[PDB]
Amino acid sequence: SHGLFKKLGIPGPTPLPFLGNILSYHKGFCMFDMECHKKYGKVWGFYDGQQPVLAITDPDMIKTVLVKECYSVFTNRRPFGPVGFMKSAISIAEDEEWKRLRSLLSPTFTSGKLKEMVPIIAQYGDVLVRNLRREAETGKPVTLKDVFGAYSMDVITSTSFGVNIDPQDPFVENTKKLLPFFLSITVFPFLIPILEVLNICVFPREVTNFLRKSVKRMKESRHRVDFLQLMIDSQNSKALSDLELVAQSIIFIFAGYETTSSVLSFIMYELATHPDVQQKLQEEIDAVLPNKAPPTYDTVLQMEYLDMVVNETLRLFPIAMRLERVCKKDVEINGMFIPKGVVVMIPSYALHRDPKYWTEPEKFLPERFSAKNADNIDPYIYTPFGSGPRNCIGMRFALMNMKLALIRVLQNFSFKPCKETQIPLKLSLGGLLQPEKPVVLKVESR
Amino acid sequence: GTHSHGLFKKLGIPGPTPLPFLGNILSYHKGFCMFDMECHKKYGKVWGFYDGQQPVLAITDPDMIKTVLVKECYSVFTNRRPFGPVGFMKSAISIAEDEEWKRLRSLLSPTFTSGKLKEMVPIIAQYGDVLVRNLRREAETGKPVTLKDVFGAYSMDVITSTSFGVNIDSLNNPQDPFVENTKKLLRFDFLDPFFLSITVFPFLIPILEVLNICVFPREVTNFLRKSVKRMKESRLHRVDFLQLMIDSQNSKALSDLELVAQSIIFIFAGYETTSSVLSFIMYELATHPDVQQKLQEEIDAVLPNKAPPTYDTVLQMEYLDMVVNETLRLFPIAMRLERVCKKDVEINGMFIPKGVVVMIPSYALHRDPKYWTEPEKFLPERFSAKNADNIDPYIYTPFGSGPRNCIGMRFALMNMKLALIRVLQNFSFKPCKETQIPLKLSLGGLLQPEKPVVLKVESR
Ligand code: HEM
Ligand code: HEM
Ligand SMILES: O=C(N[C@H](CS[C@H](Cc1ccccc1)C(=O)NCCCc1cccnc1)Cc1ccccc1)c1cccnc1
Ligand SMILES: O=C(N[C@H](CS[C@H](Cc1ccccc1)C(=O)NCCCc1cccnc1)Cc1ccccc1)c1cccnc1
C-alpha cells in the first residue's frame, strides 16, 4: 500500500514497511513538514503507517479543499479513535452529524452574543490583575500559563454555562491531563474497532467522569441564552441527547482553557523579548482607553497594533500546526488526481514560515500585518484558524477574549525576561505545539 | 455482545432473538433458504436479524422492493454488503462501490447488447456440436452421466471464446486447467470458521488485508491472473468483453489488475451459474417426462430436421422460456438480494437507519404460498402468456432488478437455451435410481444439490 505516491508521481520521503514515515516525527510535526517543504517543493506525500498523507502548499489548491469542495469531497478530518461517546463531538463528527451540530452551535458566537460577554469577561480581568499584583510586588517569576489558564477557565465556564468556579481547582487539573502510545494507532488502524466494539477509549475514564457529572450538575436550571441554553432549548423540541450535550461541553471547555492560555503565554514572551513592541502596544492601549478605562467591544476592534501583535504571534505559533481533510471520493483538483481515502494536509506551521512568502520568517515583526502590508498576505497561506465551512467556530470569541486579557494586563504591568527564561524559546519536539520549559517572566508594575 | 442487537427492538420490527456476538448465525445450520422461509412464515412481511453485529432488514413488499432496487439505487441503496478480505478483487464490478462501480457498469454494459449477443450464436453453435458428441459417447452406454461436468465444460468454452476469442477446451481435455481452477475459485461454507468468524467478528478484515490474505486462493488467482496476461494477443479483433476493456485502456483508466478482476467475475459467472442452472433444468425435465416431451415437440416445430438454432428462433420458443423461468423460480442461485443503506431513509413509511443491510429473500418469495399455487411443484404453466400477467416482477427476481441487476442476464438466458435446444434435439433424459429424487439442496452456503445430479441419456 506504500506505493501510492510512487504511482501518482508525487515525491516524498521513502516509507519504511508498516511504520511509513513516522520515524521522521522524532523532531516533531513542524520540523518534518519544513524539511519536506524545502526538499520536495510544492507537493509531497508521506505515510502515517499505512495512511497516505498528501501535503499541498498551493493557495489555489488549498482554497479548493478548505472552501470550495468542503461539503462535497473534503468534509471530514482524519478519523480519530478509539473515542467512544466522544464520536459525537463537533470536532470529531462527520458529514450530517457535523452539519447539524455546526448549525446548532454556530449562534453561540454571533456579534450579539459576543458583545454580551464583555461585562462578564471584565470581572475576571480584575482578578487577573490582583493575582499578578501579588507576584509583582514580590520579586518572583510568574508561570504565565498557570495564571492565564485560571483566567481562561473562568471565562469559558461562565460565557457557556453561567457557573462560577473561581489554585488546585479540579477543572483545571482534570482538563490539563488530556495531555506516547499513539505511535500504535498510527501503525495499527485495524485495532481501532478492536477497542471501539469492546468500548475502550483513549481519554482516561476519570477526566471524562469529572466533566460528565459536572455538566449534569451545571445543567440544573433551575437564563441568558448561552452555549448551554442553545443545546437545552433544541433538546426540548434529531435530537441532542444528554451524552452528546456533554461531548460538546468538553470541547468548548478544553478549547477555552488550553488554547487561550497557550497563545497568551506566547504573546507575552514575544512582548518581553521585544520591549519596543510591548512599549508601542502599551501606548496604543492607553490612547484608546485613557485613565485605564475599561475595554469595551468596540474599543478592542479599534486597536490596530493589538490585532497586529496577536496575528504575528499566531503566525509564529499556530497551535493547530496542520490542517487536514479526508478525500471522501476520487477527485482531480487543480489538475492533480487525489484518490479516495488520502488525507490532504496543509502544513500551516511550514507555510507560516515559508521564505518564499514571509521576509525573515523566524523574526517577530508585527509590521507584517499593518494595513499598509496586510494586502500582501494570502488568506490561504496564513491560516491560524483554518478556513472554509469547517474553520474554527470560536475564532471570533478567542480573538476577543485574548485581546481583553492583553489590554487589562498591559495597562498595569510590563514584562521582562528572567534568568530562567528560555531565550530563545524552544518548542516541544513532541506532538502538540508548546514550549519545552514553561514560560516564566518578571512582572513589573506600572 | 449486543451494541446493535436492540435496533429492531427499537424500531418495532419483529425477528428472532439474537445471541451475544453470534446474533442469529446459529440459525444458519439449515442454510440461507430454510432460515428465510421460516422467518417469512413466523414474522410476516418484514423481519430483522443480526449477522453477528450486522442488522439485516428483510423486506417482502413489492413496492418497497422496487424502491430499494430501482428507485433509490443511485442515492441510497447503491452497494452490496461489504465483502472481505478481497484484496485487489475489490475492483470487481460485483464488489465495487459508488463511483467505481458506476464507471465499470457503464464500461461493461455494451458487452451484452442485442447486436453483440446475436454475433455469439455462430460461435456457440460450434460447442453445441461438441456437447452432443460428448453426450453421444456416454449415451451409447447405460453409464450414468454427471451433468455438472459436461455442462461446465460447455459453459467454460462459451465464456472464454465470446469474451476473449480464445479456445481453451479443444473437445476436452477433460482435465482442462480453467475448469479445475474456476471450480475451487470460491467456497463459501458456513462450516469453515473463516467465513463464520468474518461475519461474527468483522474487525479482523483489515488485519488479513494487510497480511496479503485473500478469500480467493493464491494458486487459483495466479493461474487466472497470468492467463489473462497471456490472453492479450495484439496485434493479431472482434470487439468483445476483452476488447471493450483494452480500447478504453488505451485512451482513468482500467489497469492490468482491474482488467483481470472483471475477467475472473465473468469467467466464474459463465461457468458456475450457467452449468448449475442447466443441471437444475435437466433434473426437472427428467422428473417430469410430460414437460420434457412437450418441450421437445416445440423445438422440433420451430427447428425441423434438427435445424441450427438462431438468435430469432430461440426468442420464438415460448415453452422453452417457461421451463427456464420456472426452474429459476424454484432455484434462484443468488437466493438473496442485498443493498447497504448508505444513509437514513424512510421508504413506504418505514425508517431504515444508516448501515443496515436491506435484504430481499428471493428464495422465500419465489415459494411464497400467498402468490404461487403449489409453490414446491414444478409447473411451467405459471409463466404462460395467459398467466404471466399475474406475476409481480419484484416478487419473481431471479436476476435481481434495477440498475445493479445481473448484467449477464440475457447472455445467460441465450447460452442456456442454446444448450437445451441442441441437447433435446438429439437426446432424452431419464432418472437412474442413483439420481437423488427428490433433489436435496445443499444445507451449506450456496444453492447446490447435496448429491450431484446424475441422469441416464438415451439417443433419438
Ligand atoms: C487562539 C485560539 C484558537 C486557535 C488558533 C484555533 C484554531 C483552530 C483551527 C486551525 C481549527 C481547524 C480549522 C480547520 O480545520 O479548517 C479549529 C477548529 C475548532 N475550534 Fe479552534 N482555535 C482557537 C480557539 C478556540 C476556542 C476558544 C474555541 C471555543 C469553542 C474553539 C473551538 C473550535 C471548534 C469547535 C473547532 C472544530 C469546528 C469544526 O470542526 O466544525 N477554538 N480551531
Ligand atoms: C442463470 C444464470 C444467472 C443468474 C440467475 C444470475 C443472477 C444474478 C443476480 C440475482 C444478481 C444480483 C442482482 C441484484 O443484486 O439486483 C447477479 C449479478 C451479476 N451477475 Fe449474474 N446471474 C446469472 C449469470 C450470469 C452470467 C453468465 C454473467 C456473465 C458476466 C453474470 C454476471 C453478473 C454480474 C457482473 C453481476 C453484478 C452486477 C453488478 O454489480 O452490476 N451473471 N446475477
Ligand atoms: O490530531 C489529530 N486529530 C485532531 C484531534 S481531535 C481533538 C480531541 C481532543 C483533544 C484534547 C482534548 C479534548 C479533545 C479535538 O476535538 N480538538 C478540538 C478541541 C480544542 C481545540 C484546539 C485547537 C483549536 N480549536 C479547538 C483533530 C482536530 C480538530 C480541530 C483542530 C485540531 C485538530 C490526529 C493526528 C494523528 C492521527 N489521528 C488524529
Ligand atoms: O455473497 C456475498 N456477496 C456476493 C458478492 S461477492 C462474490 C465473490 C466471488 C465468488 C466466486 C467467484 C468470484 C467472486 C461475487 O462476486 N459473486 C458474483 C460473481 C458471479 C455471479 C454469481 C451469480 C450471479 N451472477 C454472477 C453477492 C453477489 C453479487 C452478485 C451476484 C451474486 C452474488 C456475501 C455473503 C455473506 C457476507 N458477505 C457477502
Author numbering:
A (entry chain B): 29 to 194, 199 to 211, 218 to 260, 267 to 281, 288 to 496
B (entry chain A): 26 to 261, 267 to 281, 288 to 496
Quote the passages of the study that discuss this structure, keeping the authors' original sentences.
Drug-metabolizing CYP3A4 is the most abundant hepatic and intestinal CYP isoform that clears over half of administered pharmaceuticals through oxidation.
The last two compounds in this series, 10a and 10b, had the head-group linked via the most optimal propyl spacer and the end-pyridine attached through a single or double amide bond. To overcome this problem, we used the same strategy and co-crystallized 10a,b with the CYP3A4 variant containing two surface mutations, K421A and K424A. The structures of 10a- and 10b-bound CYP3A4 were determined to 2.4 and 2.7 Å resolution, respectively. As a result, only partially overlapping T-shaped stacking with Phe108 could be established. That 10a has a higher inhibitory potency could be due to the stronger heme coordination (Fe–N bond of 2.16 Å vs. 2.21 Å for 10b) and more favorable interactions mediated by R3. Moreover, 10a was the series’ lead compound, whose binding affinity exceeded and the inhibitory potency matched those of ritonavir (Ks and IC50 for ritonavir were 0.019 μM and 0.13 μM, respectively, under our experimental conditions).
